[PDB]
Coordinates of C-alpha atoms in Angstrom, one line a residue:
Chain A
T2 CA -91.4 183.7 2.3
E3 CA -91.1 182.5 -1.3
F4 CA -88.1 182.8 -3.6
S5 CA -87.8 183.1 -7.4
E6 CA -85.3 181.1 -9.5
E7 CA -83.3 184.3 -9.9
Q8 CA -83.3 185.1 -6.1
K9 CA -82.2 181.5 -5.4
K10 CA -79.3 181.8 -7.8
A11 CA -78.5 185.3 -6.3
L12 CA -78.9 184.2 -2.7
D13 CA -76.7 181.1 -3.3
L14 CA -74.0 183.3 -4.7
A15 CA -74.4 185.9 -2.0
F16 CA -74.0 183.2 0.7
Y17 CA -70.4 182.6 -0.3
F18 CA -69.6 186.3 -0.2
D19 CA -71.2 186.6 3.2
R20 CA -68.9 183.8 4.5
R21 CA -65.9 185.3 2.7
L22 CA -66.3 188.7 4.3
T23 CA -66.5 187.2 7.8
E24 CA -63.6 184.9 7.0
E25 CA -61.4 187.8 6.1
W26 CA -62.1 189.6 9.4
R27 CA -61.5 186.4 11.5
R28 CA -58.2 185.7 9.6
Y29 CA -57.0 189.3 10.3
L30 CA -58.0 189.1 14.0
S31 CA -56.2 185.8 14.4
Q32 CA -53.0 187.5 13.1
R33 CA -53.4 190.6 15.3
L34 CA -54.4 188.9 18.5
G35 CA -52.6 185.6 18.3
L36 CA -55.7 183.4 18.6
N37 CA -57.0 180.7 16.3
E38 CA -60.4 180.9 14.5
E39 CA -62.0 178.4 16.9
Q40 CA -61.0 180.6 19.9
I41 CA -62.3 183.8 18.2
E42 CA -65.6 182.1 17.3
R43 CA -66.0 180.7 20.8
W44 CA -65.4 184.2 22.3
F45 CA -67.9 185.8 19.9
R46 CA -70.4 183.0 20.6
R47 CA -70.4 183.8 24.3
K48 CA -70.4 187.5 23.8
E49 CA -73.4 187.3 21.6
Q50 CA -75.1 185.2 24.3
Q51 CA -74.3 187.8 27.0
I52 CA -75.7 190.5 24.8
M53 CA -79.0 188.7 24.1
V54 CA -79.4 188.0 27.8
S55 CA -78.8 191.7 28.7
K56 CA -81.2 192.9 26.0
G57 CA -84.0 190.6 27.2
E58 CA -83.5 191.7 30.8
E59 CA -83.7 195.3 29.7
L60 CA -86.9 194.9 27.6
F61 CA -88.7 193.0 30.4
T62 CA -87.6 195.0 33.4
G63 CA -90.4 196.1 35.7
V64 CA -94.1 195.8 34.6
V65 CA -94.9 195.5 30.9
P66 CA -98.5 196.2 29.7
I67 CA -100.1 193.5 27.6
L68 CA -102.8 193.4 24.9
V69 CA -104.4 190.2 23.7
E70 CA -106.7 189.8 20.7
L71 CA -108.2 186.5 19.5
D72 CA -110.5 185.7 16.5
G73 CA -111.8 182.2 16.7
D74 CA -114.0 179.8 14.8
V75 CA -115.0 176.5 16.4
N76 CA -117.3 174.2 14.4
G77 CA -118.5 177.4 12.5
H78 CA -119.2 179.2 15.7
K79 CA -117.4 182.5 15.4
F80 CA -116.2 184.6 18.4
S81 CA -113.7 187.3 19.4
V82 CA -111.8 187.8 22.6
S83 CA -110.0 191.0 23.7
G84 CA -107.8 191.2 26.7
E85 CA -105.4 193.5 28.6
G86 CA -103.2 193.1 31.6
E87 CA -99.5 193.2 32.6
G88 CA -96.5 191.0 32.9
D89 CA -93.7 191.1 35.4
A90 CA -91.0 188.7 34.2
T91 CA -88.8 189.4 37.3
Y92 CA -91.5 187.7 39.3
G93 CA -92.5 185.2 36.6
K94 CA -96.0 186.6 36.7
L95 CA -98.7 187.5 34.3
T96 CA -102.2 188.9 34.8
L97 CA -104.9 189.3 32.2
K98 CA -108.6 190.3 32.0
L99 CA -110.1 188.7 28.9
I100 CA -113.5 189.5 27.4
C101 CA -115.7 187.9 24.8
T102 CA -116.6 190.8 22.6
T103 CA -119.1 188.9 20.5
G104 CA -121.5 187.7 23.2
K105 CA -121.4 184.3 24.8
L106 CA -118.1 182.3 24.4
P107 CA -119.1 179.1 22.6
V108 CA -116.3 177.1 24.3
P109 CA -115.2 177.0 27.9
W110 CA -112.8 179.6 29.0
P111 CA -110.4 177.0 30.4
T112 CA -109.8 175.6 26.9
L113 CA -108.5 178.9 25.8
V114 CA -106.0 179.5 28.6
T115 CA -102.9 178.1 26.9
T116 CA -103.8 180.1 23.7
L117 CA -104.4 183.4 25.4
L119 CA -97.1 184.8 26.7
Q120 CA -94.1 182.6 27.5
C121 CA -91.8 185.6 27.4
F122 CA -92.9 186.5 30.9
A123 CA -91.3 183.4 32.4
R124 CA -88.8 183.8 35.2
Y125 CA -85.5 182.1 34.1
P126 CA -83.2 181.4 37.1
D127 CA -79.8 183.1 36.8
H128 CA -78.0 179.9 35.7
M129 CA -80.6 179.4 32.9
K130 CA -81.0 182.8 31.4
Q131 CA -79.1 181.8 28.2
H132 CA -82.0 179.4 27.5
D133 CA -84.7 182.0 27.3
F134 CA -85.7 181.9 23.6
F135 CA -88.8 184.0 24.1
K136 CA -87.2 187.2 25.4
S137 CA -84.4 186.9 22.9
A138 CA -86.8 187.1 20.0
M139 CA -88.0 190.5 21.2
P140 CA -89.0 193.2 20.3
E141 CA -89.5 191.8 16.8
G142 CA -91.2 188.8 18.4
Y143 CA -92.2 185.3 17.4
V144 CA -94.9 183.3 15.8
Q145 CA -96.4 180.7 18.1
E146 CA -98.4 177.9 16.4
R147 CA -100.2 175.0 18.1
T148 CA -102.4 172.1 17.4
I149 CA -104.3 171.1 20.5
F150 CA -106.0 167.7 20.4
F151 CA -108.9 167.2 22.8
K152 CA -109.1 163.5 23.7
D153 CA -112.2 161.9 22.1
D154 CA -113.2 165.3 20.7
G155 CA -112.1 168.0 18.2
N156 CA -108.9 170.0 17.9
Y157 CA -107.8 173.6 17.8
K158 CA -105.2 175.0 15.5
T159 CA -103.8 178.4 16.5
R160 CA -101.4 180.9 15.0
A161 CA -100.3 183.8 17.2
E162 CA -97.9 186.7 16.8
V163 CA -96.3 187.8 20.1
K164 CA -94.3 191.0 19.8
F165 CA -93.9 194.5 21.0
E166 CA -96.1 197.2 19.4
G167 CA -94.5 200.3 20.9
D168 CA -94.4 200.0 24.7
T169 CA -97.0 197.2 24.7
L170 CA -96.4 193.4 24.4
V171 CA -99.2 192.1 22.1
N172 CA -100.5 188.6 21.5
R173 CA -102.6 188.5 18.4
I174 CA -104.2 185.0 17.7
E175 CA -106.3 183.3 15.1
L176 CA -107.9 180.0 16.2
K177 CA -109.7 177.4 14.2
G178 CA -111.5 174.4 15.8
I179 CA -113.0 171.5 13.9
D180 CA -114.7 168.1 14.6
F181 CA -116.1 168.9 18.0
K182 CA -119.1 167.0 19.3
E183 CA -122.0 169.4 19.8
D184 CA -122.7 167.5 23.1
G185 CA -119.1 167.0 24.1
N186 CA -117.2 168.5 27.0
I187 CA -116.2 171.5 25.0
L188 CA -119.2 172.6 23.0
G189 CA -121.5 171.3 25.8
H190 CA -119.7 173.4 28.4
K191 CA -118.9 170.6 30.8
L192 CA -115.5 171.8 32.1
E193 CA -114.9 173.2 35.6
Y194 CA -113.8 176.8 35.8
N195 CA -110.4 176.0 37.3
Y196 CA -106.9 175.0 36.2
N197 CA -104.2 172.5 37.1
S198 CA -100.5 173.2 37.2
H199 CA -98.5 171.8 34.3
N200 CA -95.0 171.6 32.9
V201 CA -94.3 172.7 29.4
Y202 CA -91.3 170.8 27.9
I203 CA -89.2 172.9 25.6
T204 CA -86.6 171.8 23.0
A205 CA -84.6 173.7 20.4
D206 CA -85.6 173.7 16.8
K207 CA -82.3 174.7 15.2
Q208 CA -83.6 174.4 11.6
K209 CA -86.3 176.9 12.2
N210 CA -84.1 179.1 14.5
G211 CA -86.7 178.5 17.2
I212 CA -88.3 176.1 19.6
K213 CA -90.8 173.3 19.9
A214 CA -92.8 172.4 23.0
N215 CA -95.0 169.4 24.0
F216 CA -97.3 169.1 27.0
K217 CA -100.6 167.6 28.1
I218 CA -103.3 169.8 29.7
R219 CA -105.7 168.2 32.1
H220 CA -109.1 170.0 32.3
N221 CA -111.2 169.0 35.3
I222 CA -114.7 167.9 34.1
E223 CA -117.9 168.8 35.9
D224 CA -119.1 165.9 38.0
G225 CA -115.7 164.2 37.8
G226 CA -112.9 163.1 35.5
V227 CA -110.3 164.9 33.4
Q228 CA -110.5 166.0 29.8
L229 CA -107.0 165.7 28.1
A230 CA -105.8 168.4 25.7
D231 CA -102.6 167.3 24.0
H232 CA -100.5 170.4 22.9
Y233 CA -97.9 170.5 20.1
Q234 CA -96.2 173.9 19.9
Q235 CA -93.7 175.6 17.6
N236 CA -92.2 179.1 17.9
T237 CA -90.4 180.9 15.1
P238 CA -88.7 184.3 15.3
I239 CA -90.3 187.1 13.2
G240 CA -86.9 188.9 12.9
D241 CA -83.5 187.7 11.8
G242 CA -81.4 188.6 14.8
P243 CA -79.7 186.0 16.9
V244 CA -82.0 184.2 19.3
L245 CA -81.1 182.0 22.2
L246 CA -81.6 178.4 21.2
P247 CA -82.1 176.5 24.5
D248 CA -80.9 173.2 26.0
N249 CA -83.9 171.0 26.9
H250 CA -85.8 172.4 29.9
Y251 CA -89.3 173.1 31.0
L252 CA -91.5 175.9 32.1
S253 CA -93.4 175.3 35.3
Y254 CA -96.9 176.8 35.2
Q255 CA -99.5 177.5 37.9
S256 CA -102.7 179.3 37.0
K257 CA -105.7 180.9 38.8
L258 CA -109.0 181.7 37.1
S259 CA -111.4 184.2 38.6
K260 CA -114.2 186.5 37.7
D261 CA -114.6 190.2 38.1
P262 CA -117.9 190.6 40.0
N263 CA -118.5 193.9 38.3
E264 CA -118.1 192.7 34.7
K265 CA -121.3 191.9 32.9
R266 CA -119.8 190.5 29.7
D267 CA -118.6 186.8 29.4
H268 CA -115.0 187.0 30.6
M269 CA -112.0 185.4 32.4
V270 CA -109.5 186.9 34.8
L271 CA -106.3 184.9 34.5
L272 CA -103.2 184.9 36.7
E273 CA -100.2 182.7 35.7
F274 CA -96.9 182.1 37.4
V275 CA -94.2 180.8 35.1
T276 CA -90.8 179.6 36.1
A277 CA -88.1 177.9 34.0
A278 CA -86.5 174.7 35.4
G279 CA -85.0 171.4 34.5
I280 CA -81.4 172.4 34.3
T281 CA -79.1 171.6 37.3
Chain B
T2 CA -58.0 178.6 25.4
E3 CA -57.2 181.5 27.7
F4 CA -57.5 185.2 27.0
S5 CA -55.6 188.3 28.4
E6 CA -57.3 191.5 29.6
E7 CA -56.1 193.1 26.4
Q8 CA -57.5 190.4 24.1
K9 CA -60.8 190.5 26.0
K10 CA -61.0 194.3 25.3
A11 CA -59.9 193.7 21.7
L12 CA -62.2 190.8 21.1
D13 CA -65.2 192.6 22.6
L14 CA -64.5 195.5 20.2
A15 CA -63.9 193.2 17.2
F16 CA -67.2 191.4 17.9
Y17 CA -69.1 194.6 17.0
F18 CA -67.2 195.1 13.8
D19 CA -67.8 191.5 12.8
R20 CA -71.5 192.0 13.2
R21 CA -71.4 195.4 11.5
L22 CA -69.7 194.0 8.4
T23 CA -72.3 191.2 8.1
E24 CA -75.1 193.7 8.7
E25 CA -73.9 195.9 5.8
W26 CA -74.0 193.0 3.4
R27 CA -77.4 191.8 4.5
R28 CA -78.8 195.3 4.2
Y29 CA -77.5 195.7 0.7
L30 CA -78.8 192.3 -0.3
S31 CA -82.3 193.1 1.0
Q32 CA -82.3 196.2 -1.2
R33 CA -81.1 194.4 -4.3
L34 CA -83.2 191.2 -4.0
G35 CA -86.4 192.6 -2.3
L36 CA -86.2 190.3 0.7
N37 CA -86.1 191.1 4.4
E38 CA -83.2 190.2 6.7
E39 CA -85.2 187.3 8.2
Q40 CA -85.7 185.8 4.8
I41 CA -82.0 186.2 3.8
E42 CA -80.8 184.7 7.1
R43 CA -83.3 181.8 6.8
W44 CA -82.1 181.1 3.2
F45 CA -78.4 181.3 4.4
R46 CA -79.2 179.0 7.4
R47 CA -80.6 176.3 5.1
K48 CA -77.8 176.7 2.5
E49 CA -75.2 176.3 5.2
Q50 CA -76.9 173.1 6.4
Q51 CA -77.0 171.7 2.9
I52 CA -73.3 172.4 2.5
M53 CA -72.3 170.8 5.7
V54 CA -74.4 167.7 4.8
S55 CA -72.7 167.5 1.4
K56 CA -69.3 167.9 2.9
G57 CA -69.8 165.1 5.4
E58 CA -71.1 162.7 2.8
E59 CA -68.0 163.5 0.7
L60 CA -65.5 162.9 3.4
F61 CA -67.1 159.6 4.5
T62 CA -67.9 158.1 1.1
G63 CA -66.8 154.5 0.7
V64 CA -64.4 152.9 3.2
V65 CA -62.3 155.1 5.5
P66 CA -59.2 153.6 7.3
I67 CA -59.1 154.1 11.0
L68 CA -56.3 154.3 13.6
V69 CA -56.9 154.1 17.4
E70 CA -54.4 154.8 20.2
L71 CA -55.2 154.7 23.9
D72 CA -52.9 155.4 26.9
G73 CA -54.6 154.3 30.1
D74 CA -54.1 154.3 33.8
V75 CA -56.5 152.5 36.1
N76 CA -55.7 152.4 39.8
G77 CA -52.1 153.0 38.9
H78 CA -52.0 150.1 36.4
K79 CA -50.6 151.6 33.2
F80 CA -51.4 150.2 29.8
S81 CA -51.5 151.1 26.1
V82 CA -53.9 150.0 23.3
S83 CA -53.2 150.4 19.6
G84 CA -55.8 149.6 16.9
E85 CA -56.5 149.8 13.2
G86 CA -59.5 149.1 11.0
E87 CA -62.0 150.7 8.7
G88 CA -65.3 152.5 8.8
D89 CA -68.1 152.5 6.2
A90 CA -70.6 155.2 7.2
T91 CA -72.9 154.4 4.2
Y92 CA -73.5 151.0 5.9
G93 CA -73.3 152.4 9.5
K94 CA -70.5 150.0 10.1
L95 CA -67.1 150.0 11.8
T96 CA -64.5 147.2 12.3
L97 CA -61.4 147.4 14.5
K98 CA -58.6 145.1 15.7
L99 CA -57.3 146.5 18.9
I100 CA -54.1 145.3 20.7
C101 CA -52.7 145.8 24.2
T102 CA -49.1 146.8 23.4
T103 CA -48.0 146.7 27.1
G104 CA -48.8 143.1 27.8
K105 CA -51.9 141.9 29.6
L106 CA -54.8 144.4 29.7
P107 CA -55.6 145.1 33.4
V108 CA -59.3 145.7 32.8
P109 CA -61.7 143.7 30.7
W110 CA -61.9 144.5 27.0
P111 CA -65.6 145.1 27.1
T112 CA -65.2 148.0 29.5
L113 CA -63.1 149.8 26.8
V114 CA -65.6 149.3 23.9
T115 CA -67.3 152.7 24.2
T116 CA -64.0 154.5 24.6
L117 CA -62.3 152.8 21.7
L119 CA -66.1 156.7 16.5
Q120 CA -69.6 158.1 16.2
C121 CA -68.8 159.7 12.9
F122 CA -69.4 156.3 11.2
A123 CA -73.1 156.3 12.1
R124 CA -75.6 155.9 9.3
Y125 CA -78.0 158.8 9.5
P126 CA -81.2 158.2 7.5
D127 CA -81.9 160.7 4.6
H128 CA -84.4 162.7 6.6
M129 CA -82.0 163.0 9.6
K130 CA -78.7 163.9 7.9
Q131 CA -78.9 167.5 9.1
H132 CA -78.6 166.1 12.7
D133 CA -75.2 164.5 12.2
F134 CA -72.8 166.6 14.4
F135 CA -70.0 164.1 14.1
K136 CA -69.4 164.2 10.4
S137 CA -69.9 168.0 10.3
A138 CA -67.0 168.6 12.6
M139 CA -64.7 166.9 10.1
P140 CA -61.9 166.9 9.0
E141 CA -60.7 169.2 11.9
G142 CA -62.6 166.8 14.2
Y143 CA -63.9 166.9 17.8
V144 CA -62.9 166.2 21.3
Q145 CA -64.9 163.5 23.0
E146 CA -64.9 163.5 26.8
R147 CA -66.6 161.0 29.1
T148 CA -67.0 160.0 32.7
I149 CA -68.1 156.4 33.0
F150 CA -69.4 155.4 36.4
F151 CA -69.3 151.6 37.1
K152 CA -72.0 150.8 39.6
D153 CA -70.6 149.9 43.0
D154 CA -67.1 150.3 41.7
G155 CA -64.7 152.9 40.2
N156 CA -64.9 155.3 37.3
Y157 CA -63.1 156.1 34.0
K158 CA -62.5 159.6 32.8
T159 CA -61.6 159.8 29.1
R160 CA -60.5 162.5 26.7
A161 CA -60.2 161.7 23.0
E162 CA -59.5 163.5 19.9
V163 CA -61.2 162.2 16.8
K164 CA -60.1 163.8 13.5
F165 CA -58.6 163.1 10.1
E166 CA -54.8 162.9 10.0
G167 CA -54.4 162.9 6.2
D168 CA -56.5 160.1 4.7
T169 CA -56.9 158.3 8.0
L170 CA -59.6 158.9 10.7
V171 CA -57.7 158.8 14.1
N172 CA -59.1 158.3 17.6
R173 CA -56.4 159.3 20.2
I174 CA -57.5 158.7 23.8
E175 CA -56.2 159.2 27.3
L176 CA -58.0 157.3 30.0
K177 CA -57.8 157.6 33.8
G178 CA -59.6 155.2 36.1
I179 CA -59.8 155.6 39.9
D180 CA -61.4 153.9 43.0
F181 CA -61.8 150.4 41.6
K182 CA -62.0 147.5 43.9
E183 CA -59.0 145.2 43.3
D184 CA -61.4 142.2 43.6
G185 CA -64.3 143.8 41.8
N186 CA -65.8 143.0 38.4
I187 CA -63.4 145.2 36.5
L188 CA -59.9 144.6 38.1
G189 CA -60.9 141.1 38.9
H190 CA -61.9 140.3 35.3
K191 CA -65.3 139.0 36.0
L192 CA -67.1 140.3 32.8
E193 CA -68.3 138.1 29.9
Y194 CA -66.6 138.7 26.6
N195 CA -69.7 139.9 24.8
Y196 CA -71.7 143.0 24.3
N197 CA -75.4 144.1 24.5
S198 CA -77.1 146.5 22.1
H199 CA -77.7 150.0 23.4
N200 CA -79.1 153.4 22.5
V201 CA -77.0 156.5 22.9
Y202 CA -79.2 159.6 23.5
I203 CA -77.9 162.7 21.9
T204 CA -78.8 166.3 22.6
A205 CA -77.4 169.6 21.4
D206 CA -75.0 171.7 23.5
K207 CA -75.3 175.1 21.8
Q208 CA -73.1 176.8 24.3
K209 CA -70.2 174.6 23.5
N210 CA -71.1 174.4 19.8
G211 CA -71.4 170.6 20.3
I212 CA -73.3 167.8 21.8
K213 CA -73.9 165.8 24.9
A214 CA -74.9 162.2 25.3
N215 CA -76.2 160.0 28.1
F216 CA -76.5 156.2 28.1
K217 CA -76.2 153.2 30.3
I218 CA -74.1 150.2 29.3
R219 CA -74.9 146.8 30.7
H220 CA -72.0 144.4 30.9
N221 CA -72.9 140.8 31.4
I222 CA -71.1 139.4 34.4
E223 CA -69.6 135.9 34.5
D224 CA -71.9 133.5 36.3
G225 CA -74.8 135.9 36.0
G226 CA -76.0 139.4 36.5
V227 CA -75.3 142.8 34.9
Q228 CA -72.6 145.4 35.7
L229 CA -73.9 148.9 35.0
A230 CA -71.7 151.5 33.4
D231 CA -73.3 154.9 33.4
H232 CA -71.9 157.1 30.6
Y233 CA -71.9 160.9 30.5
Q234 CA -70.4 162.3 27.2
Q235 CA -69.6 165.7 25.7
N236 CA -68.3 166.5 22.2
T237 CA -66.7 169.8 21.3
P238 CA -65.4 170.8 17.8
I239 CA -61.7 171.3 17.4
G240 CA -62.3 173.8 14.6
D241 CA -64.4 176.9 14.2
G242 CA -66.4 176.0 11.2
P243 CA -70.2 175.6 11.3
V244 CA -71.3 172.3 12.7
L245 CA -74.7 170.7 12.6
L246 CA -76.4 171.1 16.1
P247 CA -78.9 168.3 16.2
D248 CA -82.5 167.9 17.5
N249 CA -82.8 165.2 20.2
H250 CA -82.2 161.8 18.7
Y251 CA -80.4 158.6 19.4
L252 CA -77.8 156.3 17.9
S253 CA -78.7 152.6 17.9
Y254 CA -75.7 150.4 18.5
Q255 CA -75.2 146.7 18.1
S256 CA -71.7 145.2 18.6
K257 CA -69.8 142.0 18.2
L258 CA -66.6 141.1 20.0
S259 CA -64.4 138.3 18.6
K260 CA -60.8 137.1 18.7
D261 CA -58.2 136.6 16.0
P262 CA -57.1 133.0 16.4
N263 CA -53.7 133.8 15.0
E264 CA -53.0 136.8 17.3
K265 CA -50.8 136.0 20.3
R266 CA -51.1 139.4 22.1
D267 CA -54.0 140.4 24.3
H268 CA -56.5 141.8 21.9
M269 CA -60.1 142.5 20.8
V270 CA -61.7 142.4 17.4
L271 CA -64.7 144.8 17.4
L272 CA -67.5 145.2 14.9
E273 CA -70.2 147.8 15.5
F274 CA -73.3 148.8 13.6
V275 CA -74.5 152.3 14.3
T276 CA -77.7 153.9 13.1
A277 CA -79.3 157.2 13.9
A278 CA -83.0 157.2 14.8
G279 CA -85.7 158.8 17.0
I280 CA -86.9 161.4 14.5
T281 CA -90.1 160.7 12.7

């Protein structure tokens, strides 16, 4: 967060001691092992990577229960969504049942799909070192988006994705502004279905995290597509090393359904998510 | 380089002590300053970045003399090139006079332009944290390429770019294979000129370096363009932190000329190089 003039002077000083301490160990190692500091650092870099990969595989083995909570405000219309389900990263698979707890959802369920868990992606064996999402766990990450609906309003979202005990939790605040009251969103003119998309991921070294860009196409009732341009940033909540990825993408396919025995406004969501783009 | 079974066991053990030592300092700091470890790491990360930026600006201030040396072998034809000049990174500018010391150059000078100093790029103020090349100095970096000439042979190059005392030196070995003896390269059918190109740079976190991809278009005598597809990797020679960049590109413009008073086969090369692609 924010730093005083004193802390700035103290942290600036402490930085040099931090580097000095490490330097003394590397220097000693180089003398004992007969390796230069480049070699030692390169070994440590790969060992750290292996450790992060193993830690993420351990945390996400088998089926992980999920809780989702969203508080939203779109054009002053307030609503809340609560969801539960389970993720199975081994199979790149996530299932959720999400309920509007405040009555009728004032936007279409499909517009909330991206907002309502990239840590359940299946990364192929040769790409596991590029999985930022699992590497930030269990402390988790903050996921922020702006979503621009073409010729309409925008959502801004801030979510925290992290383990709370045994459960992976996605807690979101959403604010939407400048929507037409008769547009495709507030007018509920979007089909209850979902296309498959690629989410393009790049490293954001400065923030120790990632950024993503992608365009969602929502099918419109009676024909046409409503574009939703997504800009995404993810930042670790903890300090620990994370995996900063090479450019790659996540391939998403989704299925929306309804529980015939659920009276409340709701969405059942199944997503398959697979990393790709590295040969 | 290579590691024994013993060193592997020793390095694996030493890794944990390295992390323990750092952890003890961060823990103490958090207690003394009232900041969490994420906050301390984030401060240190930015301080390290500022330091690397300042160090690179210091090393490349004003005009830096340059030495270039290439030993080449294309289809068994052996040749050597020696060059000197100067770089002025403040102005994103490099000038070289390069001479074939072994007689007649057996390939066209334009095909060697990319092989014969990305550290002289001008990075705009808002992009200086993405300059890997200066950050690897003075220890330097290894630059490796494979260059595929369309419908002809390929070059493979390994260069070391580093300071040797006050001078920035580029020392290269080049091997070319599978060229047609009557093709555009060995047949000397390329114009003595050079188009402007963009060099697309991405981080290679695993190797603590960068990769680049770009396509050179060499104008052919009597018309047409000869494509040279470049794949590039740069790896630090030292251990010290380097700046791993967001995706961006280097914009190149080049001018080839001749010294009217030079009897040996030669090329005078002027390049302007500017980083871009970040808004």
